[PDB]
Design a protein. Structure first.
Length: 479
């Protein structure tokens, strides 16, 4: 097998079900498994908070450990991807560059640029899809060329397509004997960087640890303990294959003689992911409002202070602030916690663009996912997909049903930990003497509520009603 190959990890930070890396190994005599840490590209294309960096560095360290166990290595190269490639195609006499075929426009532009560079430097470019359950083009083809815009129509198309794609085989030590992974000269240049190298606090205090190893452990541990799986960061980073997880769930359904539906329900979660991936792959301007053909055009308020309070857990609604605090401190929050804060920010209370919430979630979520994040933010703002706009989450009462003593609030907002339960969700209703007894003066130690919920939601309902009465055709696209 003739090629000398660089495999570029972008997502797909895993050795199981990695079709591109497998294709690289099967076509090559020499391989350099590379992660390019390109601060300029990342600065131009995304927003990445400290917890996300920690999770990435952990996933890269794990990939390096796992590659090393097979007699290979991970090479982390810090630089601009085009200049890195020009240098190392020369250094290593590269004839093929492989990379996962991601659907995100910034990854597609990178891929386009690498293919142009290949035509110039003399390397072929090979990419395989490892991020989706289905061949997205086949879904579009069955739907007439456009993406299904409802989950119902999506499931109808999938029922014509059949089963998802199956995972490819695991990589073996024998793969790296047939296709050698040479130790480059100056191999210290290619170490996974430590947090200090990224100007980031050295201690990761998120209960999540990145990497394929932990993703697989969690995956197997969830199937043993059985609250959701908590696997989203691993799917978003590609430490875990959705095709592998889907098939694992099919295996359980098979061993239960088709009598266990909880694995089927969980497969449905992956199908929601596929739904948004499919819409996102074929919709112009998917991650913004303007120019987005499925998105209601809503004159959201430009109020950076309102956004600032929401982002920094200073809304004065403890349920909202506790959730935003968990997001900031841990990088993951439950699906319905995301509903609560996203509705509050957008159609419910603050009337701030879903684009701004999306960007905050992008910075803070370990599982930040281009397609999922935008699709769900359009959903939670009733900009597309969701149409029950008279239903607004109550930032006080929703948590009361869930957690009447406010243990979650007391955990994430310790300033409120001594508030009697009758005030824990609305501490501004306590008398000043009760505030003094709790050791927490509202407006000083914890803010007053930034809006009157009833007034704000009343006003926003009227605005949303006008939008939907005027933009009927756009609303109907996703109904
Ligand atoms: C405003 C908002 C923003 C969101 N942003 C993201 C994001 O950036 N990344 C992300 O992975 N999820 C996002 N979600 C979806 C959802 O909240 C998370 O996928 C889920 O909380 C992850 O927890 P889990 O892995 O335990 O999920 P499980 O219930 O165990 O689901 C298994 C997997 O299915 C997928 N999935 C589950 N729910 C959804 C959904 N509603 N839409 C699409 N895929 C889904 C995820 O890959 C998840 O890991 C967002 C939801 C909202 C409302
Ligand atoms: Mg679930």
């Amino acid at each position: 097998m003739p090629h000398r190959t660089i495999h570029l990890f972008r997502k797909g930070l895993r050795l199981h079900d990695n079709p591109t890396l497998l294709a690289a190994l099967e076509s090559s005599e020499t391989i350099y498994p590379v992660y390019v840490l390109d601060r300029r590209f990342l600065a131009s294309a995304m927003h990445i908070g400290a917890l996300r960096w920690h999770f990435l560095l952990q996933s890269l360290e794990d990939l390096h450990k796992n590659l090393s166990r097979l007699g290979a290595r991970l090479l982390v190269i810090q630089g601009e991807y085009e200049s890195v490639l020009r240098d190392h195609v020369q250094k290593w006499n590269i004839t093929q560059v492989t990379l996962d075929a991601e659907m995100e426009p910034f990854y597609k532009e990178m891929e386009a640029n690498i293919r142009r560079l290949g035509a110039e430097l003399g390397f072929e470019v090979l990419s395989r899809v490892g991020h989706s359950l289905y061949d997205t083009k086949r879904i579009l083809d069955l739907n007439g060329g456009s993406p299904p815009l409802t989950y119902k129509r999506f499931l109808h198309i999938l029922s014509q397509l059949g089963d998802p794609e199956v995972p490819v085989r695991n990589l073996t030590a024998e793969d790296f004997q047939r296709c050698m992974s040479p130790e480059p000269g100056l191999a210290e240049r290619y170490r996974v960087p430590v947090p200090a190298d990224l100007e980031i606090p050295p201690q990761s205090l998120s209960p999540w640890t990145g990497g394929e190893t932990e993703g697989l452990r969690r995956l197997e541990q969830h199937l043993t303990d059985q609250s959701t799986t908590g696997l989203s960061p691993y799917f978003s980073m590609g430490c875990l294959s959705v095709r592998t997880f889907f098939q694992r769930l099919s295996n359980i359904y098979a061993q239960a003689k088709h009598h266990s539906l909880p694995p089927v329900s969980l497969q449905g979660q992956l199908l929601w992911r596929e739904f948004f991936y499919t819409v996102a792959s074929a919709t112009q301007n998917f991650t913004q409002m303007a120019g987005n053909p499925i998105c209601l055009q809503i004159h959201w308020d430009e109020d950076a202070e309102r956004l600032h309070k929401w982002k920094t857990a200073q809304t004065g609604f403890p349920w909202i602030d506790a959730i935003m605090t968990q997001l900031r401190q841990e990088g993951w929050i439950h699906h319905l916690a995301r509903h609560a804060v996203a509705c509050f920010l957008t159609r419910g209370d603050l009337w701030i663009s879903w684009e701004e919430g999306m960007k905050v979630f992008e910075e803070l979520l370990l599982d930040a996912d281009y397609s999922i994040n935008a699709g769900n933010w359009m959903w939670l703002s009733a900009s597309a997909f969701f149409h029950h706009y008279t239903r607004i989450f109550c930032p006080v009462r929703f948590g009361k049903r869930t957690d009447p003593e406010g243990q979650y609030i007391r955990k994430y907002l310790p300033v409120l930990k001594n508030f009697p339960t009758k005030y824990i969700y609305e501490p501004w209703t306590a008398s000043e003497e009760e505030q003094r007894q709790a050791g927490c003066i509202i407006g000083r130690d914890y803010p007053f509520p930034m809006v009157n919920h009833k007034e704000a939601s009343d006003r926003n309902l009227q605005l949303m009603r006008r939008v939907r009465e005027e933009q009927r055709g756009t609303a109907q696209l996703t109904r």
